[PDB]
Design a protein that fits this description.
protease (chain B), Rossmann fold, alpha/beta, about 290 residues, 8 helices, Class_I_gatase-like (chain B), homodimer, 6-stranded mixed β-sheet, Glucose Oxidase, domain 1, 8-stranded mixed β-sheet
Chain lengths: ~290, ~290
């Protein structure tokens, strides 16, 4: 059953590399982790505030590095996205991270920037809910939160997806992407999306008008070797007001996919809505039939 | 000497083009009537009334008009009708040889048009950062509109500024920049900001919360040789709601300018509000005390 958590072996490090956390949401999160018998390590600066950021870059880097020093940690679950984790990229000690025993980094939204950087450096990562999702359709939300422990245990290996137009084909490549806006906002920097040939690019977003989504897509595709992608795979675009625009969002995305001669898929249950099922970031997967399979 | 509301004659013909967002018919008509009141001979591009979603026609249609503005021998300025979104899309197909072959005809606009201003500067073509032409068809506003003809005629040479941070010594370099969001959105692409060493980077924006301004600022500065800039000079940040953020906008921009060790000025009367005085794009200027001069 998909609301059922798997035990998480070892300990989960909780860090806040992006936006600041409300006290009551943090405490509610920890209580839910305890319900589930999850042993955790709370980063020492998770309650820090520096404007809307969870502390200074230096504070956030200390917590992320500490998460990789402890030997019993088997996963690093980001508490909140929002904005700010790209700020850490010029400070990360990548060598200290490759040397630690495997511990997938987990989050979405802004955290997409760190997922991509981790993939570039050969580090484990999972695209899934941030941990404060625990402290906030309710059934879908609960299955999404449960999907993290289930993927860490290796017991889920597929999601449903639909091919939009085109023709029947099989696409195999690395799973990359996440939040369209966050990733576009790293183009031209050291944190630009890692996009090896043949990759399946997952795109999703929230609270944008369509012109801002097109502006970011144009930028993201112009900044990578787009013609060498295996596929573009849309998750959800939630709270994105159409405002009288003549073309649907899928028409716009379809025009871009056609321009680069890459197939377009959609309705992956991933994003900011109730459906945010975890998927392994940077692994080889196959688009076949009605699913994405790893 | 003349009042800032007093226009100068424009000789020859002004090409009106719409390389970004679509144009409302009534606003266009009022624009043309004001041009006629001021004795300005104009030519409308064949596709300026095109619509393709929110864009002023397809890429091919807009390229045809832009190219035509450089093919016609009697055109002495190319005044963009509206910004909004879309002119970066023209960069892959733009025939620079064809533009460079034509007699001098400054490109005028702001907002999204900043992207084209920068590309023109990279290709050694004159450009002016100022009101888009539809601003005519909608006392400080009138002075802003008059400033375009006055700058084409070469009679205005300075704008007021105020020092905000960093060293107080004279800065001399090329005037670059414009809208922060639009320029950040070209980072990592063939249309990235042309930012030669020593430049005075002008920044301005409208309708953004502070975290979005910071995300774009971080990307723009990380994507150029920021440390080699001469200065950052802020125009207006119009309708940018603070919403309880603990740090002021001046504090945030101060922190970034300090991090790259570049002096920071503000209160340039340039942007989306009433105060949008024209300045020469890509021209060498001097920033000293309470004035920017060229």
């Amino acid at each position: 059953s998909d609301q059922t958590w798997q035990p998480i072996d070892g300990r989960v490090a909780l860090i806040a590399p992006a936006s600041a956390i409300a006290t009551e949401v943090l405490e509610a999160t920890l209580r839910q982790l305890e319900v589930h018998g999850v042993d955790y390590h709370l980063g020492r600066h998770v309650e820090a505030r520096y404007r809307y950021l969870a502390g200074t870059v230096e504070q956030r880097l200390e917590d992320l590095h500490n998460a990789f020093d402890m030997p019993d940690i088997t996963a690093v679950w980001c508490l909140r996205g929002g904005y700010g984790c790209g700020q850490l990229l010029p400070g990360l000690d990548w060598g200290r991270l490759e040397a630690a025993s495997p511990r997938p980094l987990i989050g979405f939204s802004d955290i997409s920037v760190l997922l991509s950087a981790f993939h570039r450096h050969g580090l484990p990562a999972i695209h899934g809910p941030v941990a404060t999702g625990l402290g906030l359709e309710q059934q879908e939300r609960l299955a999404s939160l449960a999907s993290v422990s289930r993927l860490l245990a290796g017991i889920d290996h597929e999601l449903p997806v639909q091919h939009l137009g085109g023709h029947k084909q099989r696409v195999e490549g690395a799973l990359i992407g996440g939040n369209l806006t966050a990733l576009a906002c790293m183009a031209g920097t050291l944190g630009g999306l890692h996009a090896p040939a043949g990759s399946i690019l997952v795109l999703e977003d929230v609270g944008e008008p369509y012109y801002r989504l097109e502006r970011s897509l144009w930028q993201l595709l112009e900044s990578i070797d787009a013609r060498q992608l295996g596929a573009i795979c849309l998750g959800s675009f939630t709270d994105c007001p159409r405002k009288e625009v003549a073309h649907s969002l899928e028409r716009i995305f379809g025009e871009y996919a056609a321009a680069i001669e890459v197939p377009l898929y959609h309705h992956l249950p991933s994003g900011a809505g109730a459906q945010n099922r975890a998927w392994p970031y940077g692994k080889t997967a196959v688009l076949e039939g009605n699913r994405l399979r790893w």
